[PDB]
Structure 1
Amino acid sequence: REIITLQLGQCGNQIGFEFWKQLCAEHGISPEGIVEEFATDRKDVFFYQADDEHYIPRAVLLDLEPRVIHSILNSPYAKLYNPENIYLGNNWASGFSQGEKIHEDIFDIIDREADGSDSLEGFVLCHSIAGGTGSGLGSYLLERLNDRYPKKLVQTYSVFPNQDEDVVVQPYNSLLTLKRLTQNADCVVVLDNTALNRIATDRLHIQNPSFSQINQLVSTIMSASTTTLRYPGYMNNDLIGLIASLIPTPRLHFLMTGYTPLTTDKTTVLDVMRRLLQPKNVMVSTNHCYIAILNIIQGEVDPTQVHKSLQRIRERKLANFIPWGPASIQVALSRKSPYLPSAHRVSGLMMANHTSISSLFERTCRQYDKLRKREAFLEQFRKEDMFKDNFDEMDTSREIVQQLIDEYHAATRPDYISWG
């Protein structure tokens, strides 16, 4: 149903601001909120129907030692939102300890925004793992959402720190936050710095300003994933029914996210499905195969081509899956948005669970272990000491992700009556 973006982390606040200006350009709205004269469709998934048809976006801004709010303040997006929703470190443990003492008023902010909405179903998070301020505070917020709301959803659109081995404290923080995301979040959409950066270097001619184009890529991905919710289709437009088909394995909830236009500047659905199953078009980094696949096609589509494309895709064995059930590739259709300022309105998306992400997780399972053996990169921060005296929480996270690896490899088998 209706979901409220909780932005946290520096890149998380960047993709939150980019997402709101993307939705301001997408919908027929002013930068005050007033309805335009070119804008019935639904505008109630992220926007409250406020005073003068002011579609005020429902959002939560969280950070520590504020940086980006100045860029919000001198912009016309301090006149679109903020009726009072903006709240003002460098390690997971420092962020955890800082979020421990101010858990009351941030939980009051969560309660205020839950009372502000009209139908609460899930809390979507626009977050960056090891963004600085996001690490630790994000995991503690995930623990608070799991403890206080077991009946609602926790969605995490997130990028994960991979530099292909830069920063020597981020594998500890990412593994601990990944354990918190397994136990305290309901669905994770995984993205990577190397995958988005490599595709950005491919489709463009940049290498240094990676952040500003990663904001555009993540905003387009998030708008494509919520296109069928914001603009009315008639399939599974609640978040619960949409993610219900998307997760085949109840512990393996990390989803591949491809996008057939890497740059948005003719084609059939067969060709973009053949494109979309290739990992080079996917922005996500032995026997690896999917468990269940679903794809969403929006544009100037002929539905009988969706028929023949599904027929040929599953029969030519490019949907690669050996499940313990019948779980399969799924087609889905969406209506492309009226009054996009973007041209070339044919666009495709895939949301599938693949075991190949386990190999990328194994790199993190290497890195922490490697940095535990050299012992000059745990850095002996005192906040890590007061977090846990035995430092066995990192071993617990390693155990949880090792169970995750064994569950991926058991889901490759036709039996899931045994995992390691």
Structure 2
Amino acid sequence: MREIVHIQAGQCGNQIGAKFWEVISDEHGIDPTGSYHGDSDLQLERINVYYNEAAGNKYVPRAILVDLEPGTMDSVRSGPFGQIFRPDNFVFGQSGAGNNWAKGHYTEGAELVDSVLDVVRKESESCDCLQGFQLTHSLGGGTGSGMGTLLISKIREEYPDRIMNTFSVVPSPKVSDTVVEPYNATLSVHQLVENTDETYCIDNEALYDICFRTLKLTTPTYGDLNHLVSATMSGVTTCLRFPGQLNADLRKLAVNMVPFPRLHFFMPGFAPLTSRSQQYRALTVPELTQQMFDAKNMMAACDPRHGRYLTVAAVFRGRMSMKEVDEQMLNVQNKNSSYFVEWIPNNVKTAVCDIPPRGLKMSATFIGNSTAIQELFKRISEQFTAMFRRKAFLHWYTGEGMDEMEFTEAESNMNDLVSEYQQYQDA
């Protein structure tokens, strides 16, 4: 009844997107049928944020599934939770995007985008008071990247006073060997800087390293990477889905998290880190607090000690002492005060939700707007320039109508972003 519209785009976007629906549907007591079989009414009080009700007391994700090839969507459909999704919200083409941002944004994607907007519009029109949109996608491929950014631009045209939120998956050569990813991602970041209000930087570099170094998985799969993504996504959406004081809608989060409109790229973090394998000792509140702020628990590969936190939100789940939570939270700030900008007083805000995630007695999710996120953008930028200075691989893009100029503006805008962060790390 403050409604969110979810869209998932491309391979990655739909993979993490389906995972998201599996996990929260379980947290809200909804089964693949769409039938509620839970034992508490916290589960239902705010269900209409993410689900429409249907006849037979049926709950149906407010979810649009977009791709330019079918592969992944067929997989969603005949998977476990596939029956839960509204069939006419599956919107797909046949040709695919060949990891090519230009195909996704300008050629192949344009052919399909109006159909997606028809479905978005139908879902918007039956919302008591729509708050905005959330999108899941990668930035290194073509559909999620180029088409997903194209959609963002068009949604903002029709709904310019609604909030736009992305879970954007940032590429890393530790996970993909596709050579043009830095292109597709620099081009996407340009879009996100201008047209989203909140972006969760979910860095495939960090997810891989957490899987290998910490979880001792010698051969990480996308399944292992995604388990981390779904846990983070459950965590960062908890204040929107359950009854609560703080960051209970997208706009309020935005207001608390974004001091400057361009600096809306968040480092998420999760504790305790787990692989898909039972965790038998519950964490103490001090442990959650120390872990959630640990660099090794960050889903964006940045060293938080290399920058300064503009704003933080922390979300603690499970039955625990609020007193201990406040003491520990306060203790992180007072022991490391120098990493928290002094010109934004009381910049850390903390929420506690009694329902834990499945699997855990206790958990914490960290959302940080820190200036160290530049390291991520510099990395993408270094990879971009290495190719761009020899105009390499550009024919794949100019062949779809693009000019070099457009690459140059994008590189520039992301380098401006980086230096604005630097600006505030030294203030």
Q: 1:216 to 1:343 in 2, by over 3 A?
A: closer
Could you tell me which residue of structure 2 aligns to residue 141 of structure 1?
Answer: 151
Assess if the C-alpha contact under 8 Å between 1:227 and 1:334 holds in 2.
no
Could you tell me which residue of structure 1 aligns to residue 9 of structure 2?
Answer: 8
Alpha-carbon shift at residue 249 of structure 1 (Å): 3.0
Find the aligned partners of 1:227 and 1:67 in 2 and give their Cα distance.
31
Which secondary structure does the structure 2 equivalent of 1:158 belong to? Answer: strand
Could you tell me which residue of structure 2 aligns to residue 418 of structure 1?
Answer: none
Could you tell me which residue of structure 2 aligns to residue 358 of structure 1?
Answer: 374
Assess if the C-alpha contact under 8 Å between 1:188 and 1:254 holds in 2.
yes
Could you tell me which residue of structure 2 aligns to residue 281 of structure 1?
Answer: 297
Alpha-carbon shift at residue 203 of structure 1 (Å): 4.0
Find the aligned partners of 1:337 and 1:386 in 2 and give their Cα distance.
49
1:194 and 2:186 matched: no
1:312 and 2:312 matched: no
Provide, for residues 315-359 of structure 1, a one-character-per-residue CA deviation record: whole Å limited to 9, x for no partner.
Answer: 222561345x23444231222327x5x243211111111111212
Could you tell me which residue of structure 2 aligns to residue 384 of structure 1?
Answer: 398
Could you tell me which residue of structure 1 aligns to residue 39 of structure 2?
Answer: 38
Assess if the C-alpha contact under 8 Å between 2:109 and 2:143 holds in 1.
no
Find the aligned partners of 1:386 and 1:17 in 2 and give their Cα distance.
31
Q: 1:297 to 1:329 in 2, by over 3 A?
A: farther
Could you tell me which residue of structure 1 aligns to residue 253 of structure 2?
Answer: 242
Could you tell me which residue of structure 2 aligns to residue 400 of structure 1?
Answer: 413
Which of 329, 344, 352 matches 1:326? 344
Alpha-carbon shift at residue 307 of structure 1 (Å): 3.0
Which secondary structure does the structure 1 equivalent of 2:312 belong to? Answer: strand
Find the aligned partners of 2:41 and 2:373 in 1 and give their Cα distance.
41
Q: 1:376 to 1:326 in 2, by over 3 A?
A: closer
What residue identity is the alignment partner of 1:369? T
Which secondary structure does the structure 2 equivalent of 1:398 belong to? Answer: helix
Find the aligned partners of 1:254 and 1:370 in 2 and give their Cα distance.
24
Provide, for residues 227-272 of structure 1, a one-character-per-residue CA deviation record: whole Å limited to 9, x for no partner.
Answer: 1221212333121112321223322111111111111715443432
Assess if the C-alpha contact under 8 Å between 2:197 and 2:261 holds in 1.
no
1:60 and 2:60 matched: no
1:162 and 2:178 matched: no
Find the aligned partners of 1:247 and 1:291 in 2 and give their Cα distance.
8
Provide, for residues 283-332 of structure 1, a one-character-per-residue CA deviation record: whole Å limited to 9, x for no partner.
Answer: 21195222222212222221222332233222222561345x23444231
Q: 1:258 to 1:37 in 2, by over 3 A?
A: closer
Give the TM-score, by structure 2 length: 0.89
1:106 and 2:116 matched: yes
Q: 1:185 to 1:6 in 2, by over 3 A?
A: same
Which secondary structure does the structure 1 equivalent of 2:366 belong to? Answer: strand
Assess if the C-alpha contact under 8 Å between 1:227 and 1:337 holds in 2.
no
Alpha-carbon shift at residue 116 of structure 1 (Å): 3.2
Which secondary structure does the structure 2 equivalent of 1:377 belong to? Answer: coil
Find the aligned partners of 2:218 and 2:398 in 1 and give their Cα distance.
34
What residue identity is the alignment partner of 1:19? F
Assess if the C-alpha contact under 8 Å between 1:179 and 1:400 holds in 2.
yes
1:94 and 2:103 matched: yes
Q: 1:47 to 1:206 in 2, by over 3 A?
A: same
Q: 1:305 to 1:177 in 2, by over 3 A?
A: same
Post-superposition, which runs of at least 4 consecutive aligned residues in structure 1 deviate over 4 A?
none
Q: 1:268 to 1:74 in 2, by over 3 A?
A: closer
Alpha-carbon shift at residue 160 of structure 1 (Å): 0.5
* Structure 1 alignment gaps of length 5 or more: 415-420
Find the aligned partners of 1:362 and 1:166 in 2 and give their Cα distance.
19
1:337 and 2:355 matched: yes
User: Size of the alignment, in residue pairs?
Assistant: 408
Could you tell me which residue of structure 1 aligns to residue 29 of structure 2?
Answer: 28
What residue identity is the alignment partner of 2:77? L
My pick for the range that moved more, 345-354 or 231-240, is 231-240
Alpha-carbon shift at residue 207 of structure 1 (Å): 4.4
1:178 and 2:210 matched: no
Which secondary structure does the structure 2 equivalent of 1:331 belong to? Answer: strand
Q: 1:304 to 1:182 in 2, by over 3 A?
A: same
Find the aligned partners of 1:52 and 1:133 in 2 and give their Cα distance.
36
Assess if the C-alpha contact under 8 Å between 1:176 and 1:397 holds in 2.
yes
Assess if the C-alpha contact under 8 Å between 1:299 and 1:347 holds in 2.
yes
Alpha-carbon shift at residue 147 of structure 1 (Å): 2.1
Could you tell me which residue of structure 2 aligns to residue 219 of structure 1?
Answer: 230
Assess if the C-alpha contact under 8 Å between 2:102 and 2:142 holds in 1.
no
Alpha-carbon shift at residue 23 of structure 1 (Å): 2.2
Find the aligned partners of 1:239 and 1:262 in 2 and give their Cα distance.
26
Which secondary structure does the structure 1 equivalent of 2:339 belong to? Answer: coil
Matches within 5 A, 1:293-312: 293-312=312-331
Assess if the C-alpha contact under 8 Å between 2:201 and 2:299 holds in 1.
no
Find the aligned partners of 2:391 and 2:222 in 1 and give their Cα distance.
31
Alpha-carbon shift at residue 44 of structure 1 (Å): 1.2
Alpha-carbon shift at residue 112 of structure 1 (Å): 1.2
1:257 and 2:258 matched: no
Could you tell me which residue of structure 2 aligns to residue 417 of structure 1?
Answer: none
Assess if the C-alpha contact under 8 Å between 2:50 and 2:61 holds in 1.
yes
Provide, for residues 110-148 of structure 1, a one-character-per-residue CA deviation record: whole Å limited to 9, x for no partner.
Answer: 211212333211110011112443231112112112222
1:150 and 2:160 matched: yes
What residue identity is the alignment partner of 2:402? K
Find the aligned partners of 1:367 and 1:83 in 2 and give their Cα distance.
40
Percent identical among aligned pairs is: 33
Instruction: From the two aligned structures, give the one with the greater helix fraction.
Output: 2
